[PDB]
Symmetry: D2
């Protein structure tokens, strides 16, 4: 079989055992990745800790140059990498190539953002007259070794957004991609290998959850854990971290609040795009519509018609709706569809499943007593919940355990800003669908949606600490 | 006569000659102020330069405590000071007392804003690998001696907004109030004297323009000139400054852009307040209305009626419209009223003048061919100019030589933000009248309206320089 | 007995059970504090969550005014409060009064630091051409309810440093002081009650660890846990926090690195002050001396003599060395003294204990094989460890599990900066003893010494989150 | 003759008249440049003002890409450009090639520094309770058209340090290089032409001072004047600017303060390098040594010997000492040498001049009564002034009208920081020669040495203004 290797301490290494990966859309084998042992994980960390001092000793300019080369290589092989990424996670080909390009953009931006690292000088005389000759020279420093873990829906992009910001500051990296998406993660590692970064500064890890899952997080060598995935695992990682710093991006149930003075055509278009992108397999996606009753009927018809125009099919054909990641996922989405349909909701598009390919579906008349009103599906299913007041919309929205982002469709901005202050989310989009949009902007979530503030600049601050040197002037 | 003295080097001093001040509303004598000689100005500067080093040597906390005491004293004597300020510049009594309270607020805020002064530490390795062991410790420093000159409409408030920000940073002060308003300026000086600031750090100057006007600005001892007054004088000061730093707040012809979807009642109320406050004797005041033709008639009627509700009379009665500062001013405003009325404009309120008291007047159908469409009157007269497109409104607005602030009345914010980017002004108020409002916000003007960015924080940065100390780590 | 009450939802409340507090120096009863039940804790949290929205709705200026009043009241009653604080934790009277004054200073500073809260505006066109009309308006927001827990050595000061920074931002407070020091904590609460803050925004909690210890931390109502205490408890709190934000200040074993070119008299004086203050019961205190062999003998003699000049006795007499907090503590310190003495170290001052009062002791010839070389004693005992190179000093220092602060005594600054970059600590003092010194400066620790960056400004950033509003310009 | 053209509005243009340029070292003709008329200057400005709006409308990312291409082209042709620059200003070949490379570094750095432009959001409730619902969205904006004028000693480097920072922010450029160095300036223009920037955004100007000198500065189309040259011209430009913003880097007389505990070998080496680089034709260069008497004799001998090792000759041979820019310059330097020698100073190296090539000379026993002690020579001549106290050194130093930078050679840093606070300069180098070193660091001068703060980041802030949009939340 086409056997892939891990990049450890400047060497490509196979393990005694391996894991075979198949294509979610065809079932065809793509190749295999190593199934690491805890001893092999120990070697990755030892190598990283060994290389850190010399990496930190380099100038910012040299570290940025390395990252810039990685990005150039990725741009060169985007079609090559995109081809395999498309097949591994059943993502449309064009979209798969876009993820690689966006990974290059974030890597370049983090390189330049991080080389403009600066500290501050504080005055003792600001707080006390007797300490006026005392000043504090404060400079930023890396936290050490960072463990970065990416998700299946963006195995390459949501890896680079952790790796580049960590490396430019002087930290070393141990990268753990998702098993379903590990081949693409190893393809990303090749660019780092070709760029020539010193041995041990960048390493990869692959294996089975029951063998190295808790082990990679609990390890004393790890100084920071940056992760994107499920809420359950995220909660667990937070506890296993102890008092060590973390960054987590978990679930979402983004709501789109639609007022009576909204532009319904623009609203309909943005909701369709945000809700069905990648078959609904996104954390930042419109997952519930809270619309004022007086404009509900009209909005639902626009959305209904647009759903019927979506393409359904294979990754190679660039279909809007592709097969879901695995059988277990489709089974879950199916169970939510049954609950709503059996409880009274009105399905405005046909319920159909062939293999793991679920056709897009719009559900009207959804009530807070239904599972679909609160649970994150991660499938092509959108619920419409009608309200009679903006106050009610705010209550239902904040009632959720999630708080990633929110959309407000209205022509009254001062009012939209007021509502936005009340919503328990990280980001609020006015007259636009939710999105991580513009990686320079802050990205965070409230309640169970996460911990820590992302976005290039914020990721760098998060994965660095401070060093204060105090002395008296004579 | 009640003879006032200047505060110089910890002493109250009279001059051989004096200037008598009268009340603009009654003509009654208020007292007299010294008419300084150039030699006396030389002594003020010599004293200030002598005291600067020891003042700079104090801690930030000690300098803030002094300023806080000045503010407490002003609050104690607000009725006392307000009484005389009301009579000196013909400002309503209540309003006169408000200026003193606002002066105390700015003094306290500048004290606390300035004690939180901090520098930065820069990395050599950001720009060049070879310089990675080189860092730069950058701290703020005062510019030296600051010459502060206040205006007649706010002789105390627009003095403190220069003095406090300058003093907290470590600069010394030479304060020159307007001749008509010098008594109030000397009343402000008493608080500084009672607070006990060291001799020479704060001093006052009074005299005749033809004797010390250019002299006080051209003097080599002066390191910064902070001024508020007329555009002509401002231009002249900029030239006399040479290459020395300055801060100027000059004229204005603020426009209120009214779109077809605006709330006309709110628009009418804000325009009336902004245009007639203190009889129009303000730089930041609505001085021209650019309204879309379709809503013009309705807006003009609301404004017409509100003008008729304004009170007209004496300062002691807290009238909205009080007598103008002097005869020359009323004569000028009168000439602008004749030009417009003789050229065809439609006066919607009677033209009346008794002494230097001009009744408020609204002019409809004003064209760009009239003087009133461009010239700053500084009197109770408001011109209405009708337009047929937002593009035309933007052209007429930017056509002016002034660029202080602007108002936009509309319910479309994204569009308002777009228009705002096109307007050549410092500040744009959406659905509200222009104003220096909130002294923490930046205050500046484009084109002929000024030089430098004001507002507490920005005033401190402006009146300070930087000191960079570079060394290599071993 | 003199029975104290908790301040809950604007009311003073007793519990069914109580805890009697005695004076560590005399054994005399001071009074009693409530022993809360889990239901009573539920009421405190419910009240706080209920009052938060209206508290957040107030302007920054109003919240600062409240805090300023609290500080003024504390200053008024400093002797009154200091008298009892001195007796409760066996701290010298004058020093006890100083803690109250410093608490007032931090409360006032946090009020003014927090009202100058500002956000940022980011450009979409910085990252992508297609997003140039998109901007992000980012403003700070409170995290919700903050649980503040203070230590016994600074029950009032290290309470206010958490409370004020939390309150000014818009968060509500639940304050849990140490049981031994709960009376002083309740005396601090009286100032908050007299200042008139709304019911529910500030509340206190007192009780037994085995009844409400884990309960107060695990509670879902709590959004942030700010704590100062032991490393063991700190680790536990971090785990119980889950993925919720925290702030921890734990143990320390600060080292004083002394080079051959150091000024030995200044070094000796600073080491004596830092090591014996409050009988060694401080986290930021010189706890081990790593001196170059060639200057060791001379330094040890200076330190020896200075130890003999320290006063020993009762709190009311302002003695340098007062009785330790409790019997268990003295027993522990005693065990460390025996280990070192039995293993070969050279005691240069007599070993004596009467009650819980341990006389100050200096130990020379300490080796890394002794407990005293690594364990935090929290008693008047100082170990001297000789080295032969700066490289050895750095290895021994970083070998510790703690990393709060460090001192370097030398006349070569460029070299001191280089060493400082290698030390695994938060703050490095050059030619001065360690200290939290100047509460505006950052205060943090590495490894097991803590989590999060303190200092007024940093405490405010830590206990706040961000809210991003994104929209497109037209 | 090899006739060069100006780049105007996307076209290369000749003028009716021209100016022939010769090589300062050989007298051989290099070619010719246009001698523009005032009408031709009018066309450059009209074209620039016409192109500005569309340039400002592009995204930051697009403007940075353009600048990055300019830098890549310069790197490609460095030998080509360096060859001619070496001959035009008589600069060593290798050094001439270094200037081009450094120009590329600054252009790339300014591109990335400028795309990370961000504003701030301010709270109304910080200053007043009644204004809590009012916020200010503040974003940066370009000033318009920038006139950049470079010097002869760095015609290309000190052009790019103005151009790149101006262009990335959205301003348009009109570049005026020195006549002696205009060919190299036009070679720099070719890179901008090849990079394909829109017509009118970048333009060049060449001509005679008596024809377009005041004209280019006084022109109303110009919004900012950025200049590097002589103090006399700089003063004049400041006055001609009126109240428009400026940036000036003028003369210098940098002093090297040498204390008794200094490392004399390191001191000697740094002084030689700083004083004789490019034959002393630098603003930031050690121009006077203020050494404590007790170590003077030893330092002077080291310096004496090192001067004798300097190479003297032609640009093509990479000599340390090359011929001076013109005859008038050599004549001036000669006059300073005579004054000192005739007044009693001790010349420790021979006085020799052949053509415009003056051999390097060291003058000991210089007194404040000699011209060489205060006047900027711009030639290979270094004066040694002995002092008896640090206080005296500080007085003599600050006595100068110049205040660019300063060096302090000592092993006592706390003391060096104290002295640095007293020195009236922009930058102070501890144990190193003066230099613009690291273009990310701030670069400014006190007194007659300039106006405005340079350095990449500071240059961008200087050539931009602010736009404040204020509105109320509902």
């Amino acid at each position: 079989t086409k056997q892939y290797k891990n990049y450890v301490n400047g060497e490509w290494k196979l393990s005694e055992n391996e894991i075979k990966i198949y294509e979610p859309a065809s079932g065809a084998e793509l190749g295999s990745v190593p199934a690491m042992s805890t001893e092999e994980v120990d070697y990755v960390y030892a190598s990283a800790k060994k290389a850190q001092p010399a990496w930190r000793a380099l100038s910012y300019i040299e570290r940025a140059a390395y990252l810039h080369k990685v990005a150039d290589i990725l741009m060169r092989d985007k079609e090559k990498i995109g081809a395999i990424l498309s097949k591994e996670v059943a993502k449309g080909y064009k979209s798969a190539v876009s993820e690689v390009v966006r990974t290059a953009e974030i890597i370049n931006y983090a390189a330049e953002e991080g080389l403009r690292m600066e500290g501050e000088v504080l005055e003792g005389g600001s707080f006390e007259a007797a300490s006026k000759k005392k000043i504090a020279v404060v400079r930023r420093e890396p936290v050490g070794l960072v463990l970065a873990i990416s998700p299946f829906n963006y195995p390459v992009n949501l890896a680079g957004s952790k790796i580049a910001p960590a490396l430019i500051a002087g930290n070393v990296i141990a990268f753990k991609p998702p098993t379903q998406g590990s081949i693409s993660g190893l393809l990303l590692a090749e660019a780092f290998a070709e760029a020539g970064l010193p041995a041990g500064v960048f390493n990869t890890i692959t294996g089975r959850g029951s063998e190295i899952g808790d082990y990679i997080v609990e390890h004393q060598a790890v100084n920071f854990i940056n992760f994107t995935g499920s809420t359950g695992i995220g909660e667990r990682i937070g506890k296993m971290a102890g008092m060590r710093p973390i960054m987590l991006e978990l679930g979402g149930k983004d709501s789109a609040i639609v007022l009576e003075d909204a532009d319904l055509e623009l609203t309909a278009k943005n909701i369709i795009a945000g809700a069905f992108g990648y078959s609904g397999q996104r954390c930042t996606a419109v997952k519930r519509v809270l619309v004022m009753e007086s404009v509900a009927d009209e909005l639902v018809e626009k959305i209904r018609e647009k759903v019927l125009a979506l393409t359904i099919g294979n990754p190679e054909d660039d279909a809007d709706i592709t097969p879901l990641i695995d059988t277990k996922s489709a089974d879950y989405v199916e169970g939510l569809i049954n609950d709503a349909n059996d409880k009274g909701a009105t399905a405005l598009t046909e319920i159909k499943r062939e293999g793991n390919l679920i056709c897009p579906i719009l559900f009207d008349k959804v009530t807070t007593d239904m599972r679909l009103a609160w649970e994150e599906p991660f499938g092509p299913v959108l619920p419409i919940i009608r309200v009679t007041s903006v106050e009610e919309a705010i209550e239902i929205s904040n009632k959720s355990e999630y708080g990633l982002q929110a959309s407000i469709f209205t022509n009254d901005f001062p009012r939209a800003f007021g509502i936005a202050e009340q919503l328990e989310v990280g980001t609020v989009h006015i007259n636009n669908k939710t999105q991580r949009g513009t990686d320079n902007f802050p990205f965070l979530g409230a309640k169970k949606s996460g911990a820590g503030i992302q976005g290039v600049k914020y990721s760098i601050e998060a994965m660095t600490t401070v060093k204060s040197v105090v002395f008296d002037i004579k």
